[PDB]
Design a protein around this nucleic acid. Structure first.
Ligand SMILES: O=P(O)(O)O[C@H]1[C@@H](OP(=O)(O)O)[C@@H](OP(=O)(O)O)[C@@H](OP(=O)(O)O)[C@@H](OP(=O)(O)O)[C@H]1OP(=O)(O)O
Ligand SMILES: [Mg+2]
Ligand SMILES: [Mg+2]
Ligand SMILES: [Mg+2]
Lengths: 222, 81, 290, 56
RNA sequence: CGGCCUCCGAACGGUAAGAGCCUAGCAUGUAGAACUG
RNA sequence: GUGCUCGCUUCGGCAGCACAUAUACUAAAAUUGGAACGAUACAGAGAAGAUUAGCAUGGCCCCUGCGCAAGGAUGACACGCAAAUUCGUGAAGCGUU
């Protein structure tokens, strides 16, 4: 219900969140729609976390409806935990996860090797899920603060608005030359055109800066 | 030190009163020039998002008097140099 | 934002009991005019009376000096238009959005330079209290300010909640009465206020002493003196108001004539005495003699 | 102290709200939304209390 | 009697920008309502 | 309402004392009003000859994004620009003749 309220509060009626937590477009989107309807890694991470908990809850709902078994419930939970990689799709929004994915694969190999030793064969029924379960509980120990902060940000942008007054953006790698000139010509203005004035009316600063620009082109061309 | 300590912790993060209406007008009240009231603080819901849209975007101190000097004007000699 | 102590509003809007129940909610809402977020107080004015709430920016309320919940003035309880026009006030209340934000901000800075006793700005320097406004004030409390709304349910018959209905189970005023359309902005700015306009047609029906024709008729006829009126006492009454040119107290009429040497004295005196002259408790009537 | 309620209280509340499309609720709408920020905590608390295959 | 075994995917970056009109949505649940010899 | 009075005092009431103390945006409502990037329909792309990569400044302009990153046609818009000023107008004072 929370993810739907968010979608429809954003008015994206052309999108649909189904009950296994996949977000799907319902038609083809024009450009303005494709743009307004992109969601970020906060929304998609909350989705896939909720998708994993649903898979676990419904393994138990089947056992409680009578459909499977205690042994098949255990084996299925152990499947979920060793294969969170291809059941959910969390890694696309946090590729750091593949470290937990590789951990749970390694534990699978260790446990199967020790399990299927003698009479028991290479079939499915091994459920020892304490290991992978541990691993994802530590994953969440960590991600819970991240997502609380990210989702607070997204909701506070939704309910107050987007603040552009005092952004204070950095100078990064693409703004380095433009910034150098912004500052060179701010400094030139300060320095001469109001500490050596008596251009009293206007110190034709916009023309002294044209001389500065032409001096640089002449240097460059020799 | 302690004032800035307050403000740093701030920006990181029923009791009674006596009221004299000043329009008291003994016929206005039941007849008491002083009212006693307990103010209490209403609880906020933890599960609720920022209320009103402060993204909005917009009268300073009196202008300082220019204890300046008088300017003395521009010769034509300098106005050409 | 503002974070304050308590609301200033008419004692009528306060209510009947000497002990009040008021709950504070910090930054609870934005002013209906100022839109500045201000701490709101909620009060239960009486049993089965609708709960009142602080309804305007603290700065917006210190500016115009009205009931910060009832919208009526704090002195007599008169709507902005009527109170101001009777005080001879033509105020430049901001209506622009940007100039309104800037205005309420600067006015909060001025109220910050103010000391919480007198209404800030020009709103005070017109303090010649007008008897028309005084008589236009409701001298007893109008606690009808807290009577509940109508319940559409019982208005169609449907309110099966019993007496637990949060609205008065009374026949709804068919909207056409212009007393129904007083938006907060209208009642605040005092523009297109039709309740106050009916008050103005009233004030035009309220009797004053109409002036006679002849600019030599400076004879003010006093009626209703009794036998306990003294000539010198009525002289002391009309004395500082100008020159009393002659006194003629008709005891066989229980009347009198005060002849004035100044037409201005006679006019201003009669107008100040109209239906308000109280000597020895007598309801004295000023008129212009023939 | 704070005393606990019967389970049908919450079971009924949630069943009623169903999926918040009925217009009756429509203020829950924004509080419901505001509770999103704490949803990764509810998931963590749910999954660490999983029921352990020797129990039904 | 030594052993030695990577990599696995998502977003932006291309299919415009608009002015207008039309019509559900979406916000409020308000304040206050007549006066005489 | 529970209970206790070696209570009136039967098993009824009544009495007395003990304990128990104030919820609530009171509303199932009723109005009230903007928007939906939806059609429609027009409309219809920076720099010099042509085709075109961008990174900025500015400000009551915003959108997607966790974002102090990035993107949105270089996001869009900025498009009169005034001004003093080369010489005179006149106005008014302060001194000289
Ligand atoms: O289905 P996958 O994800 O490919 O995993 C399988 C599988 O494990 P699951 O049972 O969890 O599905 C196998 O184990 P068995 O079930 O067959 O016992 C098997 O491993 P073994 O052959 O060692 O049993 C196999 O390995 P291979 O790649 O050799 O087919 C592989 O496990 P991996 O994760 O190593 O691929
Ligand atoms: Mg591009
Ligand atoms: Mg850009
Ligand atoms: Mg730009």
């Amino acid at each position: 219900n929370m993810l739907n309220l968010l979608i429809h509060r954003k008015n994206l009626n052309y999108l649909h969140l189904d009950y296994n937590f996949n977000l799907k477009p319902v038609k083809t989107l024009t450009t303005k729609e494709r743009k307004k309807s992109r969601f970020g890694n906060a929304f998609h991470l909350c989705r896939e976390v909720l998708r994993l908990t649903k898979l676990v809850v419904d393994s138990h709902v089947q056992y409680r409806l009578g459909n499977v078994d205690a042994f098949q419930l255990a084996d299925g939970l152990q499947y979920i935990f060793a294969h969170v990689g291809q059941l959910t799709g969390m890694y696309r929004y946090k590729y750091k996860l593949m470290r937990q994915i590789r951990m749970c694969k390694d534990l699978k190999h260790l446990i199967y090797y020790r399990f299927n030793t003698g009479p028991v064969g290479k079939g499915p029924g091994c459920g020892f899920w304490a290991a992978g379960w541990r691993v994802w509980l530590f994953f969440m120990r960590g991600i819970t603060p991240l997502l609380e902060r990210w989702l607070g940000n997204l909701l506070a942008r939704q309910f107050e608005g987007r603040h552009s007054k005092g952004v204070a953006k950095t100078v990064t790698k693409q703004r380095v030359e433009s910034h150098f000139d912004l500052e060179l010509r701010a400094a030139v203005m300060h320095d001469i055109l109001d500490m050596m004035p008596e251009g009293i009316k206007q110190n034709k600063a916009r023309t002294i800066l044209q001389h500065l620009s032409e001096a640089w082109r002449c240097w460059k061309a020799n | 030190r302690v004032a800035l300590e307050k403000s740093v912790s701030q920006k990181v993060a029923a009791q009674y009163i006596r009221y004299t209406p000043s329009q008291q007008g003994v016929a206005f009240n039941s007849g008491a020039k002083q009212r006693v009231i307990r103010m209490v603080e209403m609880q906020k819901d933890p599960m609720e998002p920022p209320r009103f849209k402060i993204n909005k975007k917009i009268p300073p101190s009196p202008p300082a008097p220019v204890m300046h000097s008088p300017s003395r004007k521009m010769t034509v000699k300098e106005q050409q140099e | 934002w503002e974070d304050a102590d308590f609301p200033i509003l008419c004692q009528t809007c306060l209510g009947e009991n000497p002990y009040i129940r008021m709950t504070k909610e910090k930054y609870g809402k934005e002013c209906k005019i100022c839109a500045r977020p201000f701490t709101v107080f909620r009060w239960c004015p009486g049993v089965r009376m609708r709960f009142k709430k602080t309804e305007v920016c603290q700065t917006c309320s210190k500016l115009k000096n009205v009931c910060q919940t009832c919208l009526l003035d704090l002195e007599y309880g008169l709507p902005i238009q009527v109170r101001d026009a009777g005080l001879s006030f033509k105020d430049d209340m901001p209506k622009s959005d940007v100039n309104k934000e800037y205005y309420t901000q600067n006015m909060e800075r001025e109220i910050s330079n103010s000391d919480g006793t007198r209404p800030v700005g020009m709103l005070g320097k017109a303090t010649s209290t007008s008897d028309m406004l005084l008589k236009l004030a409701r001298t007893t409390p109008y606690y009808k300010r807290n009577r509940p709304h109508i319940c559409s349910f019982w208005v169609k018959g449907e309110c099966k909640r019993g007496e637990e209905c949060p609205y008065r189970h009374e026949k709804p005023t068919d909207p056409d009465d212009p007393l129904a359309d007083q938006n907060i902005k209208d009642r605040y700015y005092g523009i297109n206020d039709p309740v106050a306009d009916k008050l103005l047609k009233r004030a035009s029906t309220m009797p004053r002493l109409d002036p006679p024709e002849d600019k030599t008729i400076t004879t003010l006829y006093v009626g209703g003196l009794g036998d306990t009126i003294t000539e010198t006492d009525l002289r002391n009454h009309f004395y500082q108001f100008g020159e009393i040119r002659t006194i003629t107290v008709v005891q066989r009429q229980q009347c009198a004539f005060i002849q004035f040497a100044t037409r201005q004295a006679a006019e201003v005196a009669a107008e100040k005495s109209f239906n308000k002259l109280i000597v020895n408790g007598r309801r004295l009537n000023v008129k212009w003699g023939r | 102290q704070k005393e606990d309620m019967p389970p049908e209280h919450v079971r009924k509340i949630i069943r009623d709200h169903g999926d918040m499309t009925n217009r009756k609720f429509r203020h829950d709408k924004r509080v419901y939304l505001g509770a999103l920020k704490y949803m990764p905590h509810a998931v963590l608390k749910l999954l660490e209390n999983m029921p352990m295959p020797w129990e039904q």
